[PDB]
Amino acid sequence: PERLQVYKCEVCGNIVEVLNGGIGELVCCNQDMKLMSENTVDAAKEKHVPVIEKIDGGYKVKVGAVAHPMEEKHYIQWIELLADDKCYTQFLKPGQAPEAVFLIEAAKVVARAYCNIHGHWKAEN
Amino acid sequence: MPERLQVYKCEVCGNIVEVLNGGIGELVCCNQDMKLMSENTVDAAKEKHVPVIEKIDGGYKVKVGAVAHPMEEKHYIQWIELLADDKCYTQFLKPGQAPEAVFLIEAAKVVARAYCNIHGHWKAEN
Numbered sequence: 001p002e003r004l005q006v007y008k009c010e011v012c013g014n015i016v017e018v019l020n021g022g023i024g025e026l027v028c029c030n031q032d033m034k035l036m037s038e039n040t041v042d043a044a045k046e047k048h049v050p051v052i053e054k055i056d057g058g059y060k061v062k063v064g065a066v067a068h069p070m071e072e073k074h075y076i077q078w079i080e081l082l083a084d085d086k087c088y089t090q091f092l093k094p095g096q097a098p099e100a101v102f103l104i105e106a107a108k109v110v111a112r113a114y115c116n117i118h119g120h121w122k123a124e125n
Numbered sequence: 126m127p128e129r130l131q132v133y134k135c136e137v138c139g140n141i142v143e144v145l146n147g148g149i150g151e152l153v154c155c156n157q158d159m160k161l162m163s164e165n166t167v168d169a170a171k172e173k174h175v176p177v178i179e180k181i182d183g184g185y186k187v188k189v190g191a192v193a194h195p196m197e198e199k200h201y202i203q204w205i206e207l208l209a210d211d212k213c214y215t216q217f218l219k220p221g222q223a224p225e226a227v228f229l230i231e232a233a234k235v236v237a238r239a240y241c242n243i244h245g246h247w248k249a250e251n
């Protein structure tokens with residue numbers, strides 16, 4: 001695994017993010033954890049692909065062109081902004097708006113989002 | 126059983142992961158249980174590992190520790206993390222850099238964490 005990759009255990013639901021890479025395979029419930037590759041799930045891109053809005057002193061990210069549902073059983077668990085060697089995560093809860101604001105200085109940024117149902121998604125400016 | 130924000134390490138291959146979503150199953154790697162890296166439990170110089178939090182205009186500046194920790198290839202602070210509310214901001218570092226990070230954020234209460242490749246996980250709060 002490599003830094004920043006997200007793995008999920010399809011059996012029990014554990015989901016982790018890599019802070020330090022290594023050669024070993026992450027395992028849970030007696031099976032290799034699944035690498036959650038961005039934008040691979042067959043889902044509505046207009047509801048999952050993060051939309052990056054540049055603002056003075058940072059960025060605002062909303063998932064996706066169409067506000068994603070934020071229901072108890074279907075919501076965006078978090079939004080993440082990757083800039084340089086920074087990884088900013090904003091966890092969300094059902095009922096909140098599917099968006100986040102990040103105060104940071106960086107021209108190129110990658111925005112990621114995770115739907116408990118539809119997986120990992122990303123976009124860059 | 127993993128809980129959000131916990132950090133686990135495989136002492137064999139060196140994989141280190143942070144929990145985003147908890148659950149029942151135990152994390153395993155290289156045929157052994159991954160080790161939960163509990164904060165401030167390692168026997169090391171607290172003045173070099175416990176993060177010091179400094180409030181600044183529009184955020185916080187965090188340094189590791191009151192005495193600058195080494196940033197060598199074989200001994201350095203791998204990252205500094207700031208926790209506030211449902212926010213988890215991480216600044217990864219590299220040998221040769223200063224053992225510090227600046228976070229622009231609006232939060233009266235914050236927890237700062239740091240990880241030394243040799244001496245483990247450490248934290249402090251304001």
Ligand SMILES: [O-][O-]
Pocket residue numbers: 043044047048068069115118
């Ligand atoms: O449908 O998200």
Ligand SMILES: [Ca+2]
Pocket residue numbers: 017087089143213215
């Ligand atoms: Ca993180």
Ligand SMILES: [Ca+2]
Pocket residue numbers: 151158
């Ligand atoms: Ca065990």
Ligand SMILES: [Ca+2]
Pocket residue numbers: 151158
């Ligand atoms: Ca155990």
Ligand SMILES: [Fe+3]
Pocket residue numbers: 022023024025135136137138139140154155
């Ligand atoms: Fe391992």
Ligand SMILES: [Fe+3]
Pocket residue numbers: 048068074075115117118
């Ligand atoms: Fe969805």
Ligand SMILES: [Fe+3]
Pocket residue numbers: 009010011012013014028029148149150151
């Ligand atoms: Fe599991």
Ligand SMILES: [Fe+3]
Pocket residue numbers: 169174194200241243244
């Ligand atoms: Fe150390």
